[PDB]
Amino acid sequence: MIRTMLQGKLHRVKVTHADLHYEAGSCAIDQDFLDAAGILENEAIDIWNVTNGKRFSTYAIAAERGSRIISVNGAAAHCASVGDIVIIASFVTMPDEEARTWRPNVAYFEGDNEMK
Amino acid sequence: PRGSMIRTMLQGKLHRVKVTHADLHYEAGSCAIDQDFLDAAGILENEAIDIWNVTNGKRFSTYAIAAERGSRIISVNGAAAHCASVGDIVIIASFVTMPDEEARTWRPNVAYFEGDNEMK
Amino acid sequence: MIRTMLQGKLHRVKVTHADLHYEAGSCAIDQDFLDAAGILENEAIDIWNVTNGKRFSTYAIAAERGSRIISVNGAAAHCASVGDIVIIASFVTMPDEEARTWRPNVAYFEGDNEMK
Amino acid sequence: PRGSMIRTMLQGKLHRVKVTHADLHYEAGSCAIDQDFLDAAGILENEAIDIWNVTNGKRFSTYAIAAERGSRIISVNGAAAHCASVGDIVIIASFVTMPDEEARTWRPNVAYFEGDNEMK
């Protein structure tokens, strides 16, 4: 039996403006943050808005390392405003035997998206 | 049989358990659940779960974390506290995938609750 | 690469009252309808409400053959009223090579949930 | 490597295509899409798809069916017509699963659109 497990998460990051124009429907995320959380470019992600309770799913794309960028682009902009605090999570599947000991990758933040 | 069609099946659920705690302030995302309850429903730490709030009709998905055995805690944390409040009655389910022949004889792990989150 | 494909659907059935009391969070469906659509007891299903546009997911349980029952129980009752027309669908995964020729199971209805 | 962790990845998408038809009256559920567009995005008939409506912010999931090659049709059928209207700009995506090493080098199939659903 195959389980769906938390692969990784960005724990309480803030939505920023986008430094560059990104395609609608995606969330652009500083590559440093993707590296820490194990989240891949083009991976399905869930975004849970702690500020307003909204929950939606999209996919990740890399923003430049150091940009600290969390940009919800396009249709997704209907669900998150600049300054909102969100959780970004990806999930993976694996057999039950492996899932029993699985440890997700978590990145924690302080200040203006400064990674602890 | 390689290439067999794979089903998504109810693995287990906590049926009509009561929310005991709900905090916007950070154990953010998760629902923390008494480990005895997780055991009964076959739900794992860090497993994706669906929560159906029977009280207010909201439906959301998150992941499970273990609370202390015997605490009888159901704590909806972070963003999820916008979807459930202390006192609300919820159903917490996990789903697994398996081939069709297995799915046709699968029995979910169900825990039923009454009163002070007493497992029946 | 593994594709997610429509396994089967009940095409435009009506939500009924429940003949018996069913557990909250589920949808009870006449076993004849499950048989035609290939939908299993305890299988995840999507319900799309044609009447009011609401969309949600739950799991299937068998109602008695011949009962014609489509009962959305409990929390799910917030999303479908008796007389609403819905589509009920299940999805399966399989490799791309098989998915290219995959055919879903579809049941069509007339009158008061009378299966064509 | 048996037991490898499996990722959910964007397989392909139709980026900013325009809805041409929307009917509550029964081709119910699906979104019918010009087969040329399906080919470009690697999307299959009967494949699950996510639709993000850029015009109204609605997000829903359904499955794809093929419309006639060269018709340039995007028809949102049945319940889905409550989520999109003729003229609305949408993104239609499919997701697949694959092991992690494959996912790390995966390139999605993307089709971009302008004007009269002209594929760029």
UniProtKB/Swiss-Prot annotation, chains A, C:
GO molecular function: aspartate 1-decarboxylase activity
Pathway the protein takes part in: Cofactor biosynthesis; (R)-pantothenate biosynthesis; beta-alanine from L-aspartate: step 1/1
Active-site annotation: 26, 59
Residue positions where Pyruvic acid (Ser) is found in the record: 26
InterPro entries: Asp_de-COase-like_dom_sf (IPR009010), Asp_decarbox (IPR003190)
UniProt subcellular location: Cytoplasm
Domain of life assignment: Bacteria
Cofactor(s) required, per the database record: pyruvate
SUPFAM superfamilies, sorted: ADC-like
Catalytic activity line of the entry: L-aspartate + H(+) = beta-alanine + CO2
GO terms classed as biological process: alanine biosynthetic process; pantothenate biosynthetic process; protein autoprocessing
EC assignment: 4.1.1.11
Sites where the protein binds substrate: 58, 74-76
GO cellular component, one term: cytosol
Family: Belongs to the PanD family.
Role this protein plays: Catalyzes the pyruvoyl-dependent decarboxylation of aspartate to produce beta-alanine.
Official protein name in the record: Aspartate 1-decarboxylase
Organism: Escherichia coli (strain K12)
Gene designation: panD
